[PDB]
């Protein structure tokens, strides 16, 4: 019921179509359940006491039923369409709403949650939930209605035969359900054993380096063989129980029909059934049988849809631990570009036991180039993650012109901070689209504006030399670029963004000249914090900071 | 046909069961196809020209048909069992054979191929292939046989009615197949569009750090919304074509049955059909209809099984690029333990553009401790990978006592080399099983032997202090151990292996004493090559080698 209110509100914008489709479902079902009654009359017209006017009755009964079938098909076709489209619209709203919720979450969420799981929840689970309040809902509704009308029509056609069926079917159904539960137990045992053999395989294949190192390849093969030989043993037992069940179920189905023909055939003489009447009863009995299986499948899909529901309401109602677009914007006169780290303590969410910063204090002055030095893996790149507020420190404060960056709007704070990595991330778009990404509105930037920043970044030359120019598709699924080329597109993107604060992370001879010339134009008049591996940039940097054991161990000029 | 020879040979060990199951499939199908003929006789006994002895004929006809149904169910049950078990045995042989092929492959194969893909090929594709030569094969065989007998029985029951059905069904079927192809086109267009919207989502979710850095969260949401709004547009068009098809197909099905009742009903007077005869024809026509759908589904599963086949024959017929158990074994007098690297050039298979070793030359003398020094990420751990022959160098040679390690048996070469990592890999087994892993036969080692190596490795104390002692389950799915505890179990495993060559890769105060005391006992009388981060082990090492830019830049004693 509380989860049903969520599913009712989800189907609510399509209430108009779902009500129309249900109206068309009613018509299609009414025409469909009338068919065995009229088919029974056709059979009796030909085979009860055929008169000379039997062909005249048959012709109007068949032409009449043809028109009803054409009407029923049109009503069913309209139902399927309206039900499918309603689901499509619900899924569409779920997809846009889920993706919006996902992108609003903090980086820490993505650090723990797999991309594939988010994509599967956005593609599979969204489609399943939409289907459950539409396609599945109408399927179970139709099935529930046809069973009801069917049982009612069996008692109408022959109360005696219907009473007999209803005295045989429940005991047999109870026995079959008990057998069905025992069969499910043997299936779980086999599937749990299969999982165990697969877990062993996954562990040894995953750690094949250790298996090889000890020469245990043949030892693991024999170990795995024993686990899958056990699966086979359990599967044979499950196969025997399934064969005995299917045989008993099959025989029951055949003998029950044989009983109805016998019992019905011997009914004398006012409770007697004509061959057409017996055809009505059998058709209605077969419709109840189908409808029972329909309700069974409906429950199976309703449970799958509820399982998908829980996975989606989990992300749709999720609140990010770090603000998305909440905070204050500092004035043009209030913002100078001076940044300060004060006793910062931080460990990544994936590895909280491994500290990255242990009492990290650093003062980056406005308009001055600060060089960050240290060994590989010391945690220099983590400084840029905390400055852009991708994570909040466990202890300590990061301030901009005396104002805590936690009080400010992170979207605005990031618009004033730019970054040029050693290996920049470029999307599978055109060179122009990737450059336009810097602007607050990449749809507002003109072709002349993209060309201007490309000339300053010394990128215009190689870009024009490409067959499609600025429309040359880069990224992973695009044209392979050199480190220097990728960096100059990253400089062009940063130049168009025009940040006050710039963060640099540091190659042949030809590339490194045009890149450093463009980096010079980019660095000028900006607060620069560069993580260096080259002694050339440390030498001309305003101040140098050494990071050792998560703390600024040394501070001052290159010579000092 | 060439792939069919592979599927024939796969079913060949179970030829005896599959022939028995086919024999039982023949009986079950023969009894099943006889049922509409005898049911038609039951109907006529009651409703053609009912005599006073109609109940006597009906009783023996129903009791007779009951016995035949009981026989048919028993024959079908036996078939299902024999078919399922044959498949299970084929899948079992495929699983043991595929896992054997996987573990025999070189490390480079696992570096490029995902673990999950190997597991899915070992669980899903193995089960599918087995099903295709058994369960599916019998399903398509039964379906093919029932259609054949069905059509033959329709012509037997009424040649006139059968000719009419066969003059209506093919034109309608041709039209439906043309409609079915157009419907598949609109479905592909929608599913290709869905893939595109998902690819965009996957790329932006995967690179959420870049999306946030430029404040393009709202920009990507709007970009994705446009892609899924297009999916919805294409899905509505597909929904309209599907509704029009289902309506036309449904109507055809109903009107064809209505035509057969009409045509058949008006058949006069020697070609006339009794109500039972019409029931036979309709039942046989419904059996052909089911059988046509059965052959359709059989082809669908045969193609899926052939697709699975290709994925498996790819790994089963695969030859490892590096020898598995091929080579020569050096004599006890010929082997001293002296190792030499000569102008080794190597780059990992995943990143061949990034060189790790660039003219690497190192001489490790027998019984002497050699310390390897260098910065983090210089490629010191790669030395152990090439020494254990997990990869072969692109240029250069690795020799043992003047003999090229490429000529020797890698399984034997690895039995003489042991390794103790900083973070050792322990399987989710007991402490004793993990220690026993060192021995050439972990089933041969006694409890006294595991206790002896545990006492020497200073591990016996904490192991006995555990609730289950040596039977304490460690690894990922087990009891959490400290770095020192894990290292002492790794020393116990190495002590039991008893290698001539030992490779060490380098922590509080209490752990580091008992670990270094155990490492001392382990190092003694062995050729040791240690990658150090601690100045204590470099100081007492026989010779020190410095690795810078993939080459031994410095060589000699700690003081020198
Ligand atoms: C009266 C109703 C409720 C049941 C009517 C069907 C029975 C007569 C069927 C159902 C399951 C059948 C059994 C399914 C499986 C087997 C295993 C089969 O054994 C083998 O093929 C030997 C090799 C092996 O088991 O691997 C022998 C027949 C038997 C007992 C079958 C005998 C006939 C049974 C009991
Ligand atoms: C004679 C045989 C071959 C076909 C018998 C069935 C037809 C009478 C059916 C099949 C598909 C039906 C159509 C399926 C979908 C629609 C869309 C439906 O439009 C809406 O519900 C408007 C909103 C929207 O399209 O989103 C109007 C009826 C119509 C044309 C249906 C009219 C009746 C059709 C043509
Ligand atoms: C199952 C077999 O069950 C058997 O069915 C027949 C036919 O309905 C019954 O036979 C008798 O009762 C039924 C029901 O009152 C009458 O329609 C029938 O004419 C009469 O012969 C038997 O009493 C019953 O034992
Ligand atoms: C579909 C309607 O098709 C119509 O079927 C009826 C009944 O079979 C045919 O009617 C006539 O021919 C058939 C076949 O020779 C005879 O069994 C029937 O007694 C006769 O009235 C019409 O000639 C045909 O046009
Ligand atoms: N998101 C993360 N979650 C967990 N651990 C991480 C994460 N990012 C980085 N690390 C680890 O933290 C270590 C140091 O942090 P990092 O900021 O990457 O260093 P660095 O100074 O940039 N080193 P380098 O790779 O030479 O440039 C890395 O080597 C990783 O093992
Ligand atoms: N299987 C592999 N495929 C591709 N690249 C790899 C592989 N293994 C390691 N690398 C890379 O090679 C680099 C150096 O090799 P490696 O042998 O790991 O170094 P190291 O001296 O052990 N450094 P460290 O991590 O401090 O101990 C690593 O930092 C990885 O980026």
UniProtKB/Swiss-Prot annotation, chains A, B:
Outcome of mutating residue 62 to S: Does not affect ATPase activity. Activated by Zn (II) mesoporphyrin
Family according to the record: Belongs to the ABC transporter superfamily. ABCB family. Mitochondrial peptide exporter (TC 3.A.1.212) subfamily.
Annotated function: ATP-dependent transporter located in the mitochondrial inner membrane that catalyzes the export of biliverdin from the mitochondrial matrix, and plays a crucial role in hemoglobin synthesis and antioxidative stress. Participates in the early step of the heme biosynthetic process during insertion of iron into protoporphyrin IX (PPIX). Involved in the stabilization of the iron transporter mitoferrin-1/SLC25A37. In addition may be involved in mitochondrial unfolded protein response (UPRmt) signaling pathway, although ABCB10 probably does not participate in peptide export from mitochondria.
Record's subunit section: Homodimer or homooligomer. Interacts with PAAT; this interaction regulates ABCB10. Interacts with SLC25A37; this interaction stabilizes SLC25A37 and enhances the function of SLC25A37 to import mitochondrial iron during erythroid differentiation. Interacts with FECH; this interaction may allow the formation of an oligomeric complex with SLC25A37. Forms a complex with ABCB7 and FECH, where a dimeric FECH bridges ABCB7 and ABCB10 homodimers; this complex may be required for cellular iron homeostasis, mitochondrial function and heme biosynthesis.
Gene Ontology molecular function terms on file: ABC-type transporter activity; ATP binding; ATP hydrolysis activity; metal ion binding; protein homodimerization activity
Protein name: ATP-binding cassette sub-family B member 10, mitochondrial
Stretches that traverse the bilayer: 16-39, 61-83, 135-157, 161-180, 240-263, 278-299
Shown stretch of the complete protein: 154 to 717 of 738
Subcellular localization(s) per the UniProt record: Mitochondrion inner membrane
Outcome when changing residue 485 to H: Does not rescue hemoglobin and heme biosynthetic process
């Amino acid at each position: 019921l509380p989860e049903a209110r969520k599913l009712l509100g989800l189907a609510y914008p399509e209430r108009r179509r779902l009500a129309a489709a249900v109206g068309f479902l009613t018509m299609s079902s009414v025409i469909s359940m009338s068919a065995p009654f009229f088919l029974g009359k056709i059979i009796d017209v030909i085979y009860t006491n055929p008169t000379v006017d039997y062909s005249d009755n048959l012709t109007r009964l068949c032409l009449g039923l043809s028109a009803v079938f054409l009407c029923g098909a049109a009503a069913n076709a309209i139902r399927v369409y309206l039900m499918q489209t309603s689901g499509q619209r619900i899924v569409n709203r779920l997809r846009t709403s889920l993706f919006s919720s996902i992108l609003r979450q903090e980086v820490a969420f993505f650090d723990k949650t797999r991309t594939g799981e988010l994509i599967n929840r956005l593609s599979s689970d969204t489609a399943l939930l939409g289907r459950s309040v539409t396609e599945n809902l109408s399927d179970g509704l139709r099935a529930g209605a046809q069973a009801s009308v069917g049982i009612s029509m069996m008692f109408f056609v022959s109360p005696n035969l219907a009473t007999f069926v209803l005295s045989v079917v429940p005991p047999v159904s109870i026995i079959a359900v008990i057998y069905g539960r025992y069969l499910r137990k043997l299936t779980k045992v086999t599937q749990d054993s299969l999982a165990q053999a697969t877990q062993l395989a996954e562990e040894r294949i995953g750690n094949v380096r250790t298996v090889r190192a000890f020469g245990k390849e043949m030892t693991e093969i024999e170990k795995y063989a024993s686990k899958v030989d056990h699966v086979m043993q359990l599967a044979r037992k499950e196969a025997f129980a399934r064969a005995g069940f299917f045989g008993a179920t099959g025989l029951s189905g055949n003998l029950i029909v044989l009983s109805v023909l016998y019992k019905g055939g011997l009914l004398m003489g006012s409770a007697h059934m004509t061959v057409g009447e017996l055809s009505s009863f059998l058709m209605y009995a077969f419709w109840v049988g189908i409808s029972i299986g329909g309700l069974s499948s409906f429950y199976s899909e309703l449970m799958k849809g509820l399982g998908a529901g829980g996975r989606l309401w989990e992300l749709l109602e999720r609140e990010p631990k770090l603000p998305f677009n909440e905070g204050v914007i500092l004035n043009e006169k209030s913002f100078q570009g001076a940044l300060e780290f004060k006793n910062v303590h931080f460990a990544y969410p994936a590895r909280p036991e491994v500290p990255i910063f242990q009492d990290f204090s650093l003062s980056i002055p406005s308009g001055s180039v600060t060089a960050l030095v240290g060994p590989s893996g010391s945690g220099k790149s983590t400084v840029l993650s905390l400055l852009l507020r991708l994570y909040d420190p466990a202890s300590g404060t990061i301030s901009l012109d005396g104002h805590d960056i936690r009080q400010l709007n992170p979207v605005w704070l990031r618009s004033k901070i730019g970054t040029v990595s050693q290996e920049p991330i470029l999307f599978s778009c055109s060179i122009a689209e990737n450059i336009a990404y810097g602007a607050d509105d990449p749809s507002s930037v003109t072709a002349e504006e993209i060309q201007r920043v490309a000339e300053v970044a010394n990128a215009v030359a190689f870009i024009r030399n490409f067959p499609q120019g600025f429309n040359t598709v880069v990224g992973e699924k695009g044209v392979l670029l050199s480190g220097g080329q990728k960096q100059r597109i990253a400089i062009a993107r940063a130049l168009l963004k025009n940040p006050k604060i710039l963060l640099l992370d540091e190659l042949d001879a030809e590339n490194e000249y045009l890149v450093q010339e463009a980096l010079d134009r980019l660095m000028d008049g900006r607060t620069v914090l560069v993580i260096a591996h080259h002694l050339s940039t440390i030498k001309n940097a305003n101040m140098v900071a050494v990071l050792d054991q998560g703390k600024i161990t040394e501070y001052g000029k290159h010579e000092e």
